[PDB]
């Protein structure tokens, strides 16, 4: 189940 | 940073002549990732050669299976053919039954 | 006994040649489970093993939407990574990034994990307190300062101790028939003449699962550490694993030496010999 994050950027 | 690739070339199962196996060509701990590798039977491409997802080990390097089913005899040569940035030219690896 | 949960991701960029390549794989210990190749066809999230198979619809859409956003995600973070490293557009770069979970046997977190890497280097990793960030240079610092604004830390752990356990327990169960099994690996030890006055023993495990194993050669009860040629461990396509490790012999001398293997499969670690 793999992890949902949002808008996530370096 | 750039690092060649590891090769091995070996069976699925312990090779008996007659026999179906499949044939591997375990390449691994290579960076970047784009790679070039061939099976051949007595020194041609084979045609129909699959190989596993790109994955990566803990230091990042990266590792490949490619195989293909075969049925060994006593005089088929196969080897395993790899071209990286890392090397001036392609690197032939003959399978070695007994490795 | 303990088990893992791993996602893997890479992007590489290709200059002229369309978008990055994204390929995603997810596993369970040594076992495949899923993956996501950007150059597919009609790319999807795809099961890679029995026991996740059948997991519905609902789970495909929502793991393939993750991983094309992931996709998405890294190709902004290549184009910015370019500023960050002053580089020019024309060269490929590659963007890795791993992250999941450890459990005991009794299913608690033991570890959790999310690291990234550019073009093959540490560029930044969340710490095992899973609440602080290591940056491996003044371009991940900026990545950091970044991630400690938007609280991802606090998000990554929440994840990390409670859906990544607890989808972990959930495989672990439904996969018990493979995952839950451990395969010994089948020895032997072969010898082969390379000279009159020396041979190689060549110490083989074969079909093995889990991966993880310790192969080794003594002579006269000593660890031939330096002398020992050790493969990696490779797989041999089939869900096992196969290794050997091998030593230059002198000839008469063959049972001064032993092979001792260790492998969770096995209750009592083994001690070969060359027979022939």
């Known amino acids: 189940k793999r992890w949902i994050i949002l808008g996530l950027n370096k | 940073i750039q690092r060649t690739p590891k090769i091995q070339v070996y069976s699925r199962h312990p090779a008996e002549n007659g026999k179906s196996n499949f044939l591997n060509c375990y390449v691994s701990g290579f960076h970047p990732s784009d790679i070039e590798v061939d099976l051949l039977k007595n020194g041609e491409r084979i045609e129909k050669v699959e190989h596993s997802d790109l994955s990566f080990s803990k230091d ?20 395993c053919r790899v071209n990286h940035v890392t090397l001036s030219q392609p690197k032939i690896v ?3 039954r007994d490795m | 006994g303990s ?29 495949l489970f899923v993956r996501f190749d950007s150059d597919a066809a009609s790319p999807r999230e795809e099961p890679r093993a029995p026991w996740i198979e059948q997991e519905g619809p609902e789970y495909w859409d929502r ?3 993750i991983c ?4 998405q995600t890294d190709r902004e973070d290549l184009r910015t990574l370019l500023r960050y490293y002053n580089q020019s557009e024309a060269g490929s770069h590659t963007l890795q990034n791993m992250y999941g979970c450890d459990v005991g046997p009794d299913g608690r977190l033991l570890r959790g994990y999310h690291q990234d890497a550019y073009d093959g280097k540490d560029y930044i990793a969340l710490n095992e307190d899973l609440s602080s960030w290591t940056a491996a240079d003044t371009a991940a610092q900026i990545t950091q300062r970044k991630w400690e604004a938007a609280r991802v830390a606090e998000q990554l752990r929440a994840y990390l101790e409670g859906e990544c356990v607890e989808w972990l327990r959930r495989y672990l169960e439904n996969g018990k028939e493979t995952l839950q099994r ?6 032997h030890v072969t010898h082969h003449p390379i000279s009159d006055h020396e041979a190689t023993l060549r110490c083989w495990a074969l079909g093995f699962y889990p991966a993880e194993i310790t192969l080794t050669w003594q002579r006269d009860g000593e660890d031939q550490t330096q002398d020992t040629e050790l493969v ?8 096992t694993f196969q290794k050997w490790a091998a030593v230059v012999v002198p000839s008469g001398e063959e049972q001064r030496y032993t092979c001792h293997v260790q492998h969770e499969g096995l209750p009592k670690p083994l001690t070969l010999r060359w027979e022939p």
Do not use: C
């Open chain 2, 60 to 79: 990042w390097s990266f590792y490949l299976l490619y195989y293909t089913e075969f049925t060994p005899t006593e005089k088929d040569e196969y080897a």
């Open chain 2, 94 to 96: 003959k399978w070695d």
């Open chain 3, 68 to 71: 094309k956003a992931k996709a």
């Open chain 3, 182 to 187: 451990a395969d010994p690996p089948k020895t």
């Open chain 3, 63 to 65: 793991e393939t939407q």
């Open chain 3, 3 to 31: 088990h893992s949960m791993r996602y893997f991701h890479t992007s590489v960029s290709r200059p002229g040649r369309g978008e990055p390549r994204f390929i995603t794989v997810g596993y369970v210990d040594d076992t």
């Open chain 3, 232 to 239: 990696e461990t490779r797989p041999a396509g089939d869900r």
